[PDB]
């Protein structure tokens, strides 16, 4: 568990520590402690029907980029953990849903 | 749109089997995958197995295949048993459906591709546990 401590009314930009092993496609998941788990980002830049425009990712294009969420002005319900679901090219299947990242929001 | 509602016995001693079942509603099983993910209160999500329309029984590392998750189409529910458990297997189930969506990097004639799959409509979740 990687705490990342960030402040109301200031944008968070958390990466995962699996590395790009080629052509990546990450599944960022949000999981709220008890409730239902929902997806956020899937194919690295495409918004699911239920997402506003908040929880943004990196393209794929011009390999060498990392894999991060950008979230502008994240509001005070967004206390929950987030997920890395890494699917890279030369790694095979990742059953592995990686390290939970417990987001702290201060204040 | 999918829904999604799942339900158990709750409570089990260990060496038993852990039968519960996630029903599905609105929608038929005709394009619709299914999946299983455990958490344990303490630890992270874990992925221990899917099925497919072409009844793909694979199963995760950790799991090592000593469940089974069953598909049956005709009461048209998805059902997960877990046969004998173990006392240190305690967790929170949720069952959730994906989206075998491919990601070309090279040509398809070559086999330079690979299959990433998205939970979306997911499971509120049943707590069991292992007590005395």
């Known amino acids: 568990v990687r705490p990342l401590s960030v402040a109301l009314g200031e944008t968070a930009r958390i990466s995962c520590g699996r590395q790009a092993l080629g052509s990546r496609a990450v599944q960022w998941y949000q999981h709220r402690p008890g409730q239902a788990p929902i997806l956020l980002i899937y194919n690295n830049q495409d918004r699911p029907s239920g997402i506003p425009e908040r929880f943004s990712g990196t393209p794929d294009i011009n390999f060498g980029t990392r894999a991060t969420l950008t979230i502008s002005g994240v509001e005070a319900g967004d206390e929950a953990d987030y997920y890395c679901h890494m699917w890279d090219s030369r790694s095979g299947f990742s059953w592995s849903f990686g390290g939970a990242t417990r987001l702290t929001v201060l204040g | 749109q999918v829904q999604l509602q799942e339900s158990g016995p709750g409570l089990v001693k260990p060496s038993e089997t852990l039968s519960v079942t996630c029903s599905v509603s609105?929608?038929?099983?005709?394009?619709?995958?299914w999946t299983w993910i455990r958490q344990s209160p303490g630890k992270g999500l874990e992925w221990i197995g899917y099925?497919?329309?072409?009844?793909?029984?694979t199963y995760n590392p950790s799991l090592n295949s000593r469940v089974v998750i069953s598909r049956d189409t005709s009461k048209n529910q998805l059902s997960l048993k877990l046969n004998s458990v173990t006392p240190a297997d305690t967790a929170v189930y949720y069952c959730?459906?994906?989206?075998?969506?491919?990601?070309?990097?090279?040509?398809?004639?070559?086999?330079?591709?690979?299959?990433?799959?998205?939970?979306?409509?997911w499971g509120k979740g049943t707590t069991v546990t292992v007590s005395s």
């Open positions: 099925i497919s329309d072409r009844e793909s029984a």
């Open positions: 959730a459906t994906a989206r075998r969506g491919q990601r070309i990097y090279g040509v398809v004639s070559f086999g330079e591709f690979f299959y990433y799959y998205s939970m979306d409509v």
């Open positions: 609105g929608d038929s099983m005709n394009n619709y995958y």
